[PDB]
């Protein structure tokens, strides 16, 4: 499958635009509500990725369990790429850095997202680049946690097809062979910071609900429970 078709398929697999409908409990309800709704469509997004359905059901749950928060946050960052000092969770749900105070430790997590958003601008991130990154995030997970991959190589095959798609995209974006090979580096180095926010988000979302302040969602809680933190 040629990469230029892979870039169109990644665009087609994109989940729909979602809408919504503040103190500590209200902030958490609103964000956890949006997470659970996006989690449902993220399942559909993954299935459309080439080779995903051919994986075992054991491997499909494994990648989604390991990367769901990373996948969420890169999506939230990408929706806020062109809105400064603001996190665009939904089109009608716009929050700034200030009102994270309502939740303890939230304002810390907002700044790392906003900085990653402001970074995306300076790099002039393109939509094709984001689609490969968000896809690469799903498959680069499940490289340790724990639990093993039944078909570890098949996942690497899908990862290399998206790698080649991102490479192909950069090869025809107006970049010389010097900056061509380095733009790939600048985009993949962002994956470490996103994973860092994942561990901070998971740990924050675990302190809550263990404080009995997160609403009962059966999908969100199954995804948090999939990490088995303490």
């Amino acid at each position: 499958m040629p990469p230029e078709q892979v870039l169109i398929l990644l665009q087609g697999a994109e989940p729909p635009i979602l809408c919504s409908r503040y103190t500590e409990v209200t902030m958490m309800t609103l964000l956890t509500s949006m997470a659970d709704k996006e989690l449902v469509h993220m399942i559909a997004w993954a299935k459309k990725l080439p080779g995903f359905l051919q994986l075992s059901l054991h491997d499909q749950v494994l990648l989604l369990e390991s990367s769901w928060l990373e996948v969420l946050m890169i999506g939230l960052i990408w929706r806020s790429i062109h809105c400064p000092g603001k996190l665009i969770f939904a089109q009608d749900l716009i929050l700034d850095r200030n009102e994270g105070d309502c939740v303890e430790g939230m304002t810390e997590i907002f700044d790392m997202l906003l900085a990653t958003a402001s970074r995306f601008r300076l790099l002039k991130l393109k939509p094709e680049e984001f689609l490969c990154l968000k896809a690469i995030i799903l498959l680069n997970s499940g490289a340790f946690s724990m639990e093993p991959l039944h078909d570890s190589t098949a996942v690497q095959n899908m990862l290399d097809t998206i790698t080649d798609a991102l490479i192909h995209h950069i090869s025809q974006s107006g970049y010389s062979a010097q900056q061509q090979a380095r733009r790939q580096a600048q985009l993949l180095l962002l994956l470490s910071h996103i994973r860092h926010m994942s561990n901070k988000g998971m740990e924050h979302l675990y302190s809550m609900k263990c404080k009995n302040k997160v609403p009962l969602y059966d999908l969100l809680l199954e995804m948090l429970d999939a990490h088995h933190l303490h």
Binding site: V40, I43, A44, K47, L57, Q60, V61, L64, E65, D218, L219, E222, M223
Partner: peptide, 11 residues
């Protein structure tokens, strides 16, 4: 099983 197992085996 989970809701994940259900949503993945859907259509």
């Amino acid at each position: 099983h989970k809701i994940l197992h259900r949503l993945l085996q859907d259509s």
